[PDB]
Ligand binder design. Structure first.
Ligand SMILES: [Mg+2]
Ligand SMILES: [Mg+2]
Ligand SMILES: [Mg+2]
Ligand SMILES: [Mg+2]
Ligand SMILES: [Mg+2]
Ligand SMILES: [Mg+2]
Lengths: 142, 199, 129, 84, 92, 87
RNA sequence: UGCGACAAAUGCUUUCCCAUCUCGGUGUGGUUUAGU
RNA sequence: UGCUGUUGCUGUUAAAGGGUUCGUAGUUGAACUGUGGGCUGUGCAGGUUUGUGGUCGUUG
């Protein structure tokens, strides 16, 4: 929306003031942890896991039930993604564009989008290197 | 005596009258009550504190329990407080977990190391949640009057009005006695739209 | 990107006072903003204000008596020795008879007259009159 | 008329029209419904704005279809809005 | 692509083997659960692997990319013509 | 009210009126500032000898907000009733 | 290797894996039961 | 001479916003860990307790 563009979208989710899980939610904390851990083992990113629980099990917030975030639960079980989830998606974005630009060399719009995606990667990767979620000497390669 | 197991080992030697009465009630409930039977054996209390609410009837029995039993208490708190209240006529029973507060450091490097749950703000809001547990805070305001006072008003869901309104004055006084901080209570019928109830 | 919460808050109050509004909503809130508001409230330039908790940077609703001609923040927070109070009063205050310069001292956030009486310097936060 | 607005305590009329992030205190527009499958009557909790292929365990029948906003429950489905 | 996500998951948690010869070895045993063949594969080698898969009742997937693309999707820096996952590793 | 000498003289030429809506000083040159006197009514429908008078600044009468300001003031003064009584 | 007294910010009198099977208190009606 | 402008300039048309993006140095950068408490004397503001021309059923 904002970074690398003129978009000024405000679309987002508004978390509630009342954090207590509803009285009708009878799922225990341990069973939720097994759910997220088995959903990650099924191959879902933390965002996909949360949407699955939200839409099917009635678990609005995993943190409000188990006291822990979904990524934190995966880290405790060692299931956390090696590369952070968003950096993974941007890298997948850049790869898919580059595959497209191999065949369409005249697609200058996708070339312009590619520069933004990579110039975004080199700040996200700088952040993860400074925060040590990524190894030092981690470089994005075209 | 077997009921003395419902006290911390330090207090078992010379228990108080209030502590022994609460311990005896807990020991009886651990077998008599169906729901309490599954939780009370793993449970014991620290001490029982009596609070006299001015310009009001009855007293408040503040029961301190170790913070490690927080989830255990929250499971059966409504049943537990109701049972203890009928055991003690002319009293109100409040289950407050004993929490430790680390004094705010004067050093920026020590401040980064403070456990956020041990801050006074976190502890005081947790104590307030303890005393009104079946209801939850739906809003919080600070009225800063022109004379320099800053009074905090806490809003509860208007559904719980018929269940907690009688004890709200006792909650406010016990909160001031424990935290040395003042609190006022209001009710919102539409907490989503921040709509206060007139009565 | 918002860089100064205090400057944003004081700008919002000054606009509301110019338009003659009775109340103004301030967002986001901060400890410095509330401390600044209490200083103005102490001297009677604003009425009662209410802090609304939303589990984030809160909001403040300030009731406005029409006594506040202008309030504003001074950026950056220039250092001010006890000998520099007269310089700042000359530069930013309309007169030597009224108006206040707000300082961040080690003794807290206070007006320049109070800071001078306590023999303490600090950083200039803003002004109101 | 004659009732000047108070910013701290808005009228339910004006506040109800606010965008969820423009309210005095922001909050969700969504909710949960317990939905009865049209084949087995098994109660399933379905998010109002569900977007990922809700299936009823058992019959494996799609209870809702994702839309731009709120999900669309399958025809002949029994749902009730859950509290809170 | 769904197969790319499944392959990434198998690399993360499951067990797999790369190369045509090791894939044939896993097929001769009862160990292979899925065989992925690049569209680059030589036709006779692809026919041989498909025949082994048919005899062993093993599912066979024809990857949309070439051996370079399959190696990249496996997270490898080399090319693979045939992939054989021995343990799905909770994938599917 | 007004500036004062050290000895105690009032010093000021005059004390300008303040708008009852926005408290702004009413200057001598605006010429759009008005004074409205509302007659006081006794228990009977007849009016007394006293009146209630409010001052409105000229700029508020330019913005078109003088009617709203008078409504608010009249309600605060206990002269006007916000809502009709219960049926 | 035992032994005594304490704590403990998170329940091992747990969790998981197999297998056998109307009464009180409170307010002027809500509350944990327990009979329908 | 506020015509060098930190205090303190100007940039639609007078001289002056880079054609558009990206971008290192550099500058700038969102909240939160936090109301001390009673006691006494002294001057102020409003949650209810006996008493003491209006609305309101018919003392209310
Ligand atoms: Mg930028
Ligand atoms: Mg010039
Ligand atoms: Mg020009
Ligand atoms: Mg331009
Ligand atoms: Mg810096
Ligand atoms: Mg800051």
């Amino acid at each position: 929306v904002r970074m690398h563009g003129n978009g000024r979208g405000k679309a987002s989710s508004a978390l509630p003031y009342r954090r207590t899980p509803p009285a009708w939610l009878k799922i225990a904390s341990r069973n939720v942890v097994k759910m997220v851990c088995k959903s990650s083992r099924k191959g879902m990113m933390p965002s996909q896991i949360g949407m699955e629980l939200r839409d099917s099990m009635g678990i609005a917030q995993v943190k409000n039930v188990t006291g822990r975030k979904i990524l934190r639960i995966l880290k405790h079980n060692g299931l956390a993604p090696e590369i952070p989830e968003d950096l993974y998606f941007l890298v997948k974005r850049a790869t898919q564009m580059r595959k497209h630009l191999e065949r369409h060399t005249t697609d200058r719009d996708t070339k312009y989008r590619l520069i933004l995606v990579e110039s975004r990667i080199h700040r996200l990767a700088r952040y993860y290197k400074r925060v040590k979620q990524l190894p030092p000497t981690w470089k994005y390669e075209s | 005596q077997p009921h003395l197991r419902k006290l911390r080992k330090l207090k078992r030697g010379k228990p108080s009258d209030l502590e022994e009465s609460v311990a005896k009630a807990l020991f009886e409930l651990e077998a008599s009550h169906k729901t309490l039977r599954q939780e009370l054996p793993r449970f014991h209390v620290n001490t029982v504190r009596e609070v006299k609410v001015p310009r009001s009837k009855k007293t408040v029995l503040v029961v301190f329990y170790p913070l490690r039993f927080l989830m255990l208490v929250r499971k059966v708190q409504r049943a537990l407080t109701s049972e203890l209240e009928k055991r003690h006529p002319g009293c109100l029973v409040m289950l407050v977990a004993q929490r430790q507060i680390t004094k705010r450091p004067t050093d920026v490097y020590k401040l980064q190391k403070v456990q956020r749950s041990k801050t006074s703000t976190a502890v005081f809001e947790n104590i307030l949640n303890d005393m009104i547990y079946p209801s939850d805070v739906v809003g919080r305001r600070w009225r800063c009057r022109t004379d320099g006072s800053k009074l905090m008003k806490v809003f509860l869901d208007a559904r719980d009005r018929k269940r907690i309104e009688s004890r709200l004055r006792a909650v406010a006084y016990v909160y001031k006695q424990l935290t040395h901080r003042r609190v006022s209570f209001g009710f919102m019928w539409n907490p989503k739209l921040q709509q206060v109830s007139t009565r | 990107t918002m860089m100064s919460v205090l400057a944003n808050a004081l700008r919002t109050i000054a606009s509301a006072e110019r338009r003659g509004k009775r109340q103004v909503l301030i967002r986001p809130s901060s400890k410095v903003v509330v401390k600044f508001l209490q200083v103005m409230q102490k001297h009677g330039y604003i009425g009662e204000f209410e802090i609304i908790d939303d589990h984030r940077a809160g909001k403040i609703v300030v009731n406005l008596n029409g006594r506040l001609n202008k309030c504003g923040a001074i950026c950056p927070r220039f250092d001010c020795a006890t000998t520099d109070y007269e310089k700042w009063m000359k530069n930013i205050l309309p007169s030597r008879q009224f108006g206040f310069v707000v300082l961040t001292t080690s003794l807290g956030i206070m007006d320049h007259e109070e800071a001078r009486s306590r023999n303490t310097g600090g950083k200039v936060l803003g002004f109101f009159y | 008329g004659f009732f000047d607005a108070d910013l701290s305590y808005p009228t339910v009329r004006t506040e109800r029209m606010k965008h969820k992030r423009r309210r005095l205190v922001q909050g969700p527009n969504s909710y949960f419904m317990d939905v009865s499958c049209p084949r087995c009557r098994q109660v399933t909790v379905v998010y109002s704005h569900a977007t990922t292929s809700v299936e009823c365990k058992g019959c494996s029948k799609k209870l809702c279809r994702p839309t731009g906003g709120k999900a669309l429950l399958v025809e002949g489905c029994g749902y009730r809005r859950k509290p809170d | 692509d769904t197969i790319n996500a499944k392959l990434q998951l198998v690399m993360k948690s499951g067990k797999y083997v790369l190369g045509t010869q090791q894939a044939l070895t896993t097929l001769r045993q009862g160990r292979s659960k899925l065989v992925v063949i690049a569209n680059n594969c030589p036709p006779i080698r692809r026919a041989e692997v498909e025949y082994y898969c048919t005899l062993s009742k093993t599912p066979i997937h024809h990857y949309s990319g070439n051996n370079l693309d399959l190696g990249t999707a496996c997270g490898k820096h080399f090319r693979t013509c045939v992939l054989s996952v021995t343990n799905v590793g909770d994938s599917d | 009210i007004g500036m004062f000498n050290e000895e105690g003289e009032n010093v000021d030429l005059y004390i300008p009126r303040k708008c009852h809506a926005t408290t702004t000083l009413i200057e001598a040159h605006d010429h759009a500032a008005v004074q409205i006197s509302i007659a006081n009514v006794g228990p009977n429908g007849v009016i007394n000898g006293t009146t209630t008078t409010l001052c409105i600044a000229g700029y508020l009468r330019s913005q078109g907000e003088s009617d709203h300001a008078i409504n608010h003031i009249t309600i605060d003064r206990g002269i006007m009733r916000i809502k009709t009584g219960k049926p």
